Every structure is written in C-alpha cells, then in structure tokens.
C-alpha cells in the first residue's frame, strides 16, 4: 500500500554544439506523470495554470543552478570546457499505506558516478571524494539539507498524496501478469524452459524456477524487466532441462496484482 514520488534530473553540456540539455522527469511509483525538457498522465492535466507556471519556473531556475554546478565541477576536477559532462540527480519521498513519510531521497551523480547524497536523516551528507567534500562544506554552511528536508517532508509528501488521490483509478491499482511457458530443445538430452510474464504493473515482480521444490536460482537466466510500450512491463526467466523431466520443473510467479502466486509449468496442445 506504500507509494513514492521521484524526480530524475539531467544536465548534459554540449560544448560547441549548443546549450546544455536539461531534463526533469517525474514519476509516481512506476508511472511517469510529467517531463520538462529544454529540447522540447491525465490526472495531472487537471492541475490549474498556476501549477504549470510555477513548476516551469522552478525547472528553468533549476537549469541555471545546474549550469553553475557543471562549471564548478569542471573546476574541482580541473577539466577543460571542451568535453561534454553530465550532472544527474534523483530525489523524492516514500510514504507508507497511511500516506506518511517513510524516507526522503536526494542524491547527485557526476559523469555517471555517485557524487554526494543526502543521508536518511535528511540532515547530513555523504560525499564520494574530495571534490564532493568541497560541495558538502559549501552546503553545510548554506544549510542546504534543511531546505531539502523541508521539501521532502512537506511539499513532497503533500503532492504525492494529492496525485495518488487524483489518479487513484490508475495508481493504487496493479495489473496482474499474463503468463506462459515456452519450450525449445537445445539438443536431444537438454532443452530450454522459459517463463514469461507480460502486461503487468507495477514493474516489481519475481520469477523463479524450482525443481523438486528447490529454487534453481543458479541455473536461471533472468532478463532485465522491460517496457512493453503500453505502460505495462515484461520479464522472463529461462532454465535448461532434460527431455522428459520437464514436469519436474515449475515456474513461481509473484506479483502484486495476483490474488495468489502462480506455480506454472510448460505445455503443448
């Protein structure tokens, strides 16, 4: 019954080719609801003109702060203005079934590497290296964590509860997976069993193969959960099995939308 709201921000310089690419994507659970892009859900559309003017203004100002960060970062690492660099951050809050704050988040990455993160107490920072320690010092003096904390415990939790209510029909409802097992012989003795899960939401799901009731955790090829293209997700797990002893193998599907975890097994007509 718990939910989350998270923003995924990007700032990537493009020296000699144009201005930096700035992006901000907001999600509630696994649903994207807003996207700001310098290069550019229904329940968010109902937000008045002030909501959009204000958020757009925040994004614009945020990109200016990012321009400042990018150039300070270049100085810390003594980099030239010639190479492209990327500044990223993820922030948001997690609330329990009662709509109450469980934990806040705010971390930054420079060129794909963890840089500095606001600790769970939303009062202290964890810097990744000496450069991030310069940032940490600057932010402790400016009491940045207090400002971020105010947002995470207040604004963040408040609007997530609002979005959860405004879009309840799609948000607090999970889509069960459509499953099927496939068989494809690798040879006479060994074959292949692949367990499929399609059209489910949220993305969270567990697929495990077991034989004689024991998880074949080590002989299971599990792929990364992928988007179907229609808000739902897909995923499969494969395992090799000897011809004939296939009924000895079962696929166990765990998912929020399922009334009870499935114990599937392959088949022909």
């Amino acid at each position: 019954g718990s939910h989350s709201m998270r923003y995924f921000d990007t700032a990537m310089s493009r020296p000699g080719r144009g201005e930096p690419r700035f992006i901000s994507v907001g999600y509630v659970d696994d649903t994207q609801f807003v996207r700001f892009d310098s290069d550019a859900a229904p329940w968010i559309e109902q937000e008045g003109p002030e909501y959009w003017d204000r958020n757009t203004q925040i994004f614009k100002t945020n990109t200016q702060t990012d321009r400042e960060s990018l150039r300070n970062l270049r100085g810390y690492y003594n980099q030239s203005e010639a190479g492209s660099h990327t500044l990223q951050s993820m922030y948001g809050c997690d609330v329990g079934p009662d709509g109450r704050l469980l934990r806040g988040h705010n971390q930054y990455a420079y060129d794909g590497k963890d840089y500095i993160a606001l600790n769970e107490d939303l009062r202290s920072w964890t810097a990744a290296d000496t450069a991030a320690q310069i940032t940490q010092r600057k932010w402790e003096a400016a009491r940045v964590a207090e400002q971020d904390r105010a947002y995470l415990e207040g604004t963040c939790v408040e609007w997530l509860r609002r979005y959860l209510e405004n879009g309840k029909d799609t948000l607090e409802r999970a889509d069960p997976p459509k499953t099927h097992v496939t068989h494809h012989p690798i040879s006479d003795h060994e074959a292949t069993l692949r367990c499929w899960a399609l059209g489910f939401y949220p993305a969270e799901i567990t697929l495990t193969w077991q034989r004689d009731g024991e998880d074949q955790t080590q002989d299971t090829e599990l792929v990364e959960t992928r988007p179907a293209g229609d808000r739902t997700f897909q995923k499969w797990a494969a395992v090799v099995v000897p011809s004939g002893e296939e009924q000895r193998y079962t696929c166990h599907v765990q998912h929020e939308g399922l009334p009870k975890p499935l114990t599937l097994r392959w088949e022909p007509s």
Partner: peptide, 9 residues
Amino acid sequence: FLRGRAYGL
C-alpha cells in the same frame, strides 16, 4: 511538484 534547487554543487 518540483523542488527548487538554489545551490550549485
């Protein structure tokens, strides 16, 4: 709702 960040790294 977006958070405004005023301090750069």
